[PDB]
Amino acid sequence: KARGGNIGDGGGAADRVINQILTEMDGMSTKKNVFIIGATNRPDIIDPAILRPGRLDQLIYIPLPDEKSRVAILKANLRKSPVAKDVDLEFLAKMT
Amino acid sequence: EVGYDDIGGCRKQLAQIKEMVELPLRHPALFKAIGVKPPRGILLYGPPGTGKTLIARAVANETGAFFFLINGPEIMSKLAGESESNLRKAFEEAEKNAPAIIFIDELDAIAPKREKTHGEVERRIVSQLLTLMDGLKQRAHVIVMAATNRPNSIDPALRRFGRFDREVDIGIPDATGRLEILQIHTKNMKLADDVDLEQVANETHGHVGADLAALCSEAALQAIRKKMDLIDLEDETIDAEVMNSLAVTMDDFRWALSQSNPSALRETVVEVPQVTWEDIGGLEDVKRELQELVQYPVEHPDKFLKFGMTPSKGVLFYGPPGCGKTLLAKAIANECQANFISIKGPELLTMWFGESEANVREIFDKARQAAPCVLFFDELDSIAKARGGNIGDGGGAADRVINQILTEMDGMSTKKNVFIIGATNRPDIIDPAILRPGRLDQLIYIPLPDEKSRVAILKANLRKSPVAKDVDLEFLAKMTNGFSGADLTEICQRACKLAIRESIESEIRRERQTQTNPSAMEVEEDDPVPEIRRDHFEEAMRFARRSVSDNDIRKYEMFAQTLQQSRGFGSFRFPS
Amino acid sequence: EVGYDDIGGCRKQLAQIKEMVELPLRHPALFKAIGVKPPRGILLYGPPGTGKTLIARAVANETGAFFFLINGPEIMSKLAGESESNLRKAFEEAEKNAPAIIFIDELDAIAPKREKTHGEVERRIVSQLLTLMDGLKQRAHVIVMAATNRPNSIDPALRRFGRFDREVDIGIPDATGRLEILQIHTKNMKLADDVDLEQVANETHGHVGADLAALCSEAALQAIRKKMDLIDLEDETIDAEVMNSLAVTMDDFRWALSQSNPSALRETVVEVPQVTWEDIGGLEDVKRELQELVQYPVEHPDKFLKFGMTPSKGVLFYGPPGCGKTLLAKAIANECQANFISIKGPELLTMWFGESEANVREIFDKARQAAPCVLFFDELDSIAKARGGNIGDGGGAADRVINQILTEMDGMSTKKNVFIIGATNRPDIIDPAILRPGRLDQLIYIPLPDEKSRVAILKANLRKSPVAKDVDLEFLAKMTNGFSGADLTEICQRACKLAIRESIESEIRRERERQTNPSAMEVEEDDPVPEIRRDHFEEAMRFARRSVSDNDIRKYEMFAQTLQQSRGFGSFRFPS
Ligand SMILES: Cc1cc(OCc2nnc(SC3CCCC3)n2-c2cccnc2)ccc1-c1ccc(S(C)(=O)=O)cc1
Ligand SMILES: Cc1cc(OCc2nnc(SC3CCCC3)n2-c2cccnc2)ccc1-c1ccc(S(C)(=O)=O)cc1
Ligand SMILES: Cc1cc(OCc2nnc(SC3CCCC3)n2-c2cccnc2)ccc1-c1ccc(S(C)(=O)=O)cc1
Ligand SMILES: Nc1ncnc2c1ncn2[C@@H]1O[C@H](COP(=O)(O)OP(=O)(O)O)[C@@H](O)[C@H]1O
Numbered sequence A: 001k002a003r004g005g006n007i008g009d010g011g012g013a014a015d016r017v018i019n020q021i022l023t024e025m026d027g028m029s030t031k032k033n034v035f036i037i038g039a040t041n042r043p044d045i046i047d048p049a050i051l052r053p054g055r056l057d058q059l060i061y062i063p064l065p066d067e068k069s070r071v072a073i074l075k076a077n078l079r080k081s082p083v084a085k086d087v088d089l090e091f092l093a094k095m096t
Numbered sequence B: 001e002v003g004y005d006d007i008g009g010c011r012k013q014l015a016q017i018k019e020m021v022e023l024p025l026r027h028p029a030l031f032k033a034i035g036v037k038p039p040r041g042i043l044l045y046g047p048p049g050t051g052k053t054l055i056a057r058a059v060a061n062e063t064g065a066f067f068f069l070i071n072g073p074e075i076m077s078k079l080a081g082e083s084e085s086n087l088r089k090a091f092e093e094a095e096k097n098a099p100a101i102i103f104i105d106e107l108d109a110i111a112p113k114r115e116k117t118h119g120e121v122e123r124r125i126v127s128q129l130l131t132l133m134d135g136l137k138q139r140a141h142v143i144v145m146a147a148t149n150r151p152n153s154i155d156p157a158l159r160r161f162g163r164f165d166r167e168v169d170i171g172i173p174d175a176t177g178r179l180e181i182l183q184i185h186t187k188n189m190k191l192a193d194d195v196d197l198e199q200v201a202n203e204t205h206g207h208v209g210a211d212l213a214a215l216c217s218e219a220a221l222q223a224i225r226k227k228m229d230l231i232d233l234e235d236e237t238i239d240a241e242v243m244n245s246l247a248v249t250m251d252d253f254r255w256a257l258s259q260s261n262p263s264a265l266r267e268t269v270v271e272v273p274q275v276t277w278e279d280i281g282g283l284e285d286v287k288r289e290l291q292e293l294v295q296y297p298v299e300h301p302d303k304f305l306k307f308g309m310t311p312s313k314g315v316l317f318y319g320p321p322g323c324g325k326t327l328l329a330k331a332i333a334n335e336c337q338a339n340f341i342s343i344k345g346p347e348l349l350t351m352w353f354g355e356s357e358a359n360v361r362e363i364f365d366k367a368r369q370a371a372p373c374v375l376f377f378d379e380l381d382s383i384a385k386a387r388g389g390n391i392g393d394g395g396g397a398a399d400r401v402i403n404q405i406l407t408e409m410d411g412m413s414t415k416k417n418v419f420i421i422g423a424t425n426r427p428d429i430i431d432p433a434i435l436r437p438g439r440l441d442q443l444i445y446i447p448l449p450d451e452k453s454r455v456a457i458l459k460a461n462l463r464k465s466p467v468a469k470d471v472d473l474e475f476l477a478k479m480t481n482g483f484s485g486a487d488l489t490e491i492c493q494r495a496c497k498l499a500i501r502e503s504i505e506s507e508i509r510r511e512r513q514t515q516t517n518p519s520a521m522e523v524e525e526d527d528p529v530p531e532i533r534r535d536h537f538e539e540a541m542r543f544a545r546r547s548v549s550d551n552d553i554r555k556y557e558m559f560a561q562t563l564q565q566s567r568g569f570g571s572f573r574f575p576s
Numbered sequence C: 001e002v003g004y005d006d007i008g009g010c011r012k013q014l015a016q017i018k019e020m021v022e023l024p025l026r027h028p029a030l031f032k033a034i035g036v037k038p039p040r041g042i043l044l045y046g047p048p049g050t051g052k053t054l055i056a057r058a059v060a061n062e063t064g065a066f067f068f069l070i071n072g073p074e075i076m077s078k079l080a081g082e083s084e085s086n087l088r089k090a091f092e093e094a095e096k097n098a099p100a101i102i103f104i105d106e107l108d109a110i111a112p113k114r115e116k117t118h119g120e121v122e123r124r125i126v127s128q129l130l131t132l133m134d135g136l137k138q139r140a141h142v143i144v145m146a147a148t149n150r151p152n153s154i155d156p157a158l159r160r161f162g163r164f165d166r167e168v169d170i171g172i173p174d175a176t177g178r179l180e181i182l183q184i185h186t187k188n189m190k191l192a193d194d195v196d197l198e199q200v201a202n203e204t205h206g207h208v209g210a211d212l213a214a215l216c217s218e219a220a221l222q223a224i225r226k227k228m229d230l231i232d233l234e235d236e237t238i239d240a241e242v243m244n245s246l247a248v249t250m251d252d253f254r255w256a257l258s259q260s261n262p263s264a265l266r267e268t269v270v271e272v273p274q275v276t277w278e279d280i281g282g283l284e285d286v287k288r289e290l291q292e293l294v295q296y297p298v299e300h301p302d303k304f305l306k307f308g309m310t311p312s313k314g315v316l317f318y319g320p321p322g323c324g325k326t327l328l329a330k331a332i333a334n335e336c337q338a339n340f341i342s343i344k345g346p347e348l349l350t351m352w353f354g355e356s357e358a359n360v361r362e363i364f365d366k367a368r369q370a371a372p373c374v375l376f377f378d379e380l381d382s383i384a385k386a387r388g389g390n391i392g393d394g395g396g397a398a399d400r401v402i403n404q405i406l407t408e409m410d411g412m413s414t415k416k417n418v419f420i421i422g423a424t425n426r427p428d429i430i431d432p433a434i435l436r437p438g439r440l441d442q443l444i445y446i447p448l449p450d451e452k453s454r455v456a457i458l459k460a461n462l463r464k465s466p467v468a469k470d471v472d473l474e475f476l477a478k479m480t481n482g483f484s485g486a487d488l489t490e491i492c493q494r495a496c497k498l499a500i501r502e503s504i505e506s507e508i509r510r511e512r513e514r515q516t517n518p519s520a521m522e523v524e525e526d527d528p529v530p531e532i533r534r535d536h537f538e539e540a541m542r543f544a545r546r547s548v549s550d551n552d553i554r555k556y557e558m559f560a561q562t563l564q565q566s567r568g569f570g571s572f573r574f575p576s
């Protein structure tokens, strides 16, 4: 994103930091314990080399929370705060 | 001797040092029966000439501790191999007179090594000093206070636990402290009645305690040169009565201020702004929202804790130029009585051009030290404008300085006191990451001042100037349909300029008239224009102009409605 | 011995030093009965050969203080471990003869460490010198004056409070001071009647006092070589009468000036401009506005203070090239009798290309020291032109040099004396931040000279040249419908060139005529063309040209009306 995304730089998707991350991952796996998890809101602009085998190949899509998921999120956010039982949370989650 | 009265500036770190050192020194026997570790070392740092040595001496005198002064270059000037003996003997002597205070003035000379550490003998001196400082067996009550211009100048191992574990930034004295410093430095010269030391104190921005003393001495010397020299009656000792007959006049102080050259004007200022809500005539919704976001967490922290809500620590002001965003930030800081730090756009542009973003880390650390503080990033969109705005660079909105600011903010919130306020006249080009939660998410729009707001702005601008009651201000404010605060200030300044020019020209002519035609009886009619009149304001308004066009206000209205709260929930009702 | 008469240049810092040192030295007993701290150290800095040591010696002689000279390399050339003894003994001896003045010539050798601080023994010397300098127990009246090429060359701890707390920049002598230096250096050579030392002084720009002495000595040696050598009558001691018979002629001085090579031509000049309002024929509205903005705050500061108005400290001249903006700035500086500093475009471009904007800080500090001063940034739009102007760089108008200038201006205004004047031929491309309040907000438009203005410009250009009364100047000025000041200067220069060529060719032929046909009686008819005639001016005007097209004047008119005072308030009346 910093380099662009629609036009960007004249060069390709490769950058210094991602290249170093790829080198470390390629030199990784020896440890058998470190597990790399990557989160990105712009999958289109992510470097394709990141998704090659031996890298973050398992792509997982996180969709918008469902009604039940929304209810759980509201409960988690409001667990600490004193919430009156009168306010129905399922209705609010479904409304959103 | 020297005491708290001598220590001027009222900068409120002397109180912190007192709270630090009384019990270790004022009640030394108490720590013998209680298991607690007192402050083994205190690092006083700040601009030179701020009285750090004076503060240490005053604390030693007021607490009765045996004060020992280890001058930096005094030991450094000694021969290698025997300076170490001097340092060791100094600590032993201070140990003997328990409780004792060992003051190391100019600590950045004994242990200047910042891991560069040039030379050989200086490494020995730093290591031996480290051994001594860490060698305090917690017996007796020797407290080692050191002076340094900046915390990072001394060796980092000196900054570690047990050597110097707590630091106080004395900093430049403020207007209130500058006035108190002037009072302390002007107490035996028999100051004149006309001179008040208040106007000089306000005009004395940028001076330090040493600078204030030098200015006072220069004014005294000007007074001595102006008078008592013409008579030329001098002896071995000037007569006390003859010297007392002179009074330091305001003119002498003014000349001295003109000949001051303060020794660190550039140094950043951490000061409680004097601006008040009165200066801004309105923004009641904005005023209440700012009061909420800033004041409520501190005035009523318990109620924030009860609901388990963490108050936002970032607010971004957006609006047309000249509407009072900087003034609003100063007013909000003043209401909470918290220190205000302002980072204008030139500083950010300098950090960006120089590729030196580590200054952001230093700025945030300074804001953290001066808590409670309101860290204001004025005109934060400057870097985006510098890179473009319509097309800009090929890359995105991310830049080095904003990225460092985001990193510091993400690593912030720990302090619980620093509050970040951002002002930007181009919200469209501001980096979106700035507005994410945990950052300056609370966007506040500052609109053009209303008629009542315009009246208040005119009154604030014209409070100092003599304005005739004939000139109606409400009519002028209402007449200005869309003038910004800057436009109103320009109108007032132009009216004052017209009045000043007319007064100067008139009294100049009137003086010709006496020179050309010497009148037999001298009878001055006073000033031909003693206050600003209706005609001056009419001529000034003739040149009134609207700096802010309606198209840029339209863009701001677009962004405001670009933060639109949806269009389907306005009638949300729970099922009952 | 040496005194104020020997000290030449009339540079007006000797007066400041006198005011500094009389009472501490001229009236030492006075400070015994009065509690005041005198100047413990004074740092005289400037280009080498400016007489700093001479000034110190003259002050010591004229005040009776025992002068002690501690040569930099004299102590530095001594063996390590015993040079410290030399410095300590020098201070003790100066202490014994109280009051005494200790002069440290070439201070940048004893303590050159700028925090780089190479070596080991030199660190000892700097630290011990620091201990001695700070070790002055305020007893006796020893004043330590030091000489250094630049303030930043010496160790910063030497610049701190109590070591060297006040600095004086002797600087290069000016035309008036160059003339006085020539007079002092030409007093025993029996200067000839034809030589006046005024033309040489004007042509002597760039020399220092040492340079002036060297030029005078070279002229004397040329005189000795030209005569008294042909006779070759020499003995053990040349006869006084024989040597007195020679007179240094203007030709010898001219040759010496040709063989001068001044030792610091590049050094920036801080000089009161000799230009006067007479050189500019008009701009009465502009002249009055400039008089207001600059002169009024100082001539009548009380009236500015009465109305609570702070006068603007920045003015931006915009107009077509060659209309006299630089001359106008020089004239305004001359009227206020304030030092003038000019920063031309090449300097800004050099700072921009070299990525060295810290020079702006140095320039502003120099302007601050030479107060009252008019800091003029000539052709400030050069960087914008260098980056483009129609398309330019991808980024905005912000650049490193302008950003540094803005930072210095924002940090300025404290001095109350420096006044920033900006000239730009391309107002459209100038950065808008330059025009914000607190910056060069007062925009002044310099239009093409009028008919009367053109007449005045022609008279000023032709004042030195011999112009025949036959050639009517008003007709020529009126004839030039839109010629700029540069165009008129070019026309005058071309006319002078034509006259010079005609005179040279004619006298050359006339000399052939006397070589080809030796006349029996020599009777020179004088010069065939003694002054500039109508035909020369007609031929020159034949090549007259309008450098400034009407389209660029149209763009300037657009910008001028782009600062339009609205169109609805012209009839503003208060309700009555
Ligand atoms: C047996 C095996 C274990 C392994 O590692 C297991 C492991 N332990 N800790 C961790 S990490 C920790 C767990 C939670 C956070 C991270 N892991 C691990 C490994 C991979 C992915 N996630 C975790 C690798 C590779 C192998 C094998 C597979 C086939 C053959 S053959 C010649 O074809 O017959 C030989 C060897
Ligand atoms: C109680 C609390 C106070 C706080 O800080 C208050 C504070 N003091 N000085 C300042 S600063 C100064 C004031 C004027 C200028 C700046 N602040 C402050 C904090 C935030 C925003 N503005 C000011 C933070 C967070 C909490 C909490 C909230 C919920 C829970 S739980 C587990 O859900 O039950 C636990 C802890
Ligand atoms: C009285 C005053 C003088 C001043 O400075 C005057 C000055 N002297 N040398 C110079 S410089 C030199 C002159 C020729 C070349 C340059 N100046 C000067 C100042 C501004 C612009 N040009 C010159 C500033 C500001 C003030 C004041 C105005 C209002 C108030 S209140 C609280 O509202 O009642 C308090 C203080
Ligand atoms: N607030 C103050 N009250 C009285 N004197 C002050 C004050 N601030 C600075 N000074 C002056 O500063 C002089 C030297 O400064 P100092 O106390 O040594 O600080 P530093 O070591 O940082 O330079 C002192 O002699 C004192 O007169």
Ligand SMILES: Nc1ncnc2c1ncn2[C@@H]1O[C@H](COP(=O)(O)OP(=O)(O)O)[C@@H](O)[C@H]1O
Pocket (backbone or CB within 6 Å): C006, C007, C008, C009, C047, C048, C049, C050, C051, C052, C053, C054, C055, C105, C147, C181, C184, C185, C208, C209, C210, C213
């Ligand atoms: N204004 C002056 N009047 C008389 N002599 C001068 C003057 N300026 C420079 N000189 C000459 O400069 C010579 C040496 O320069 P000096 O005084 O030592 O200055 P610096 O130490 O900076 O080089 C002196 O011998 C003196 O003759």
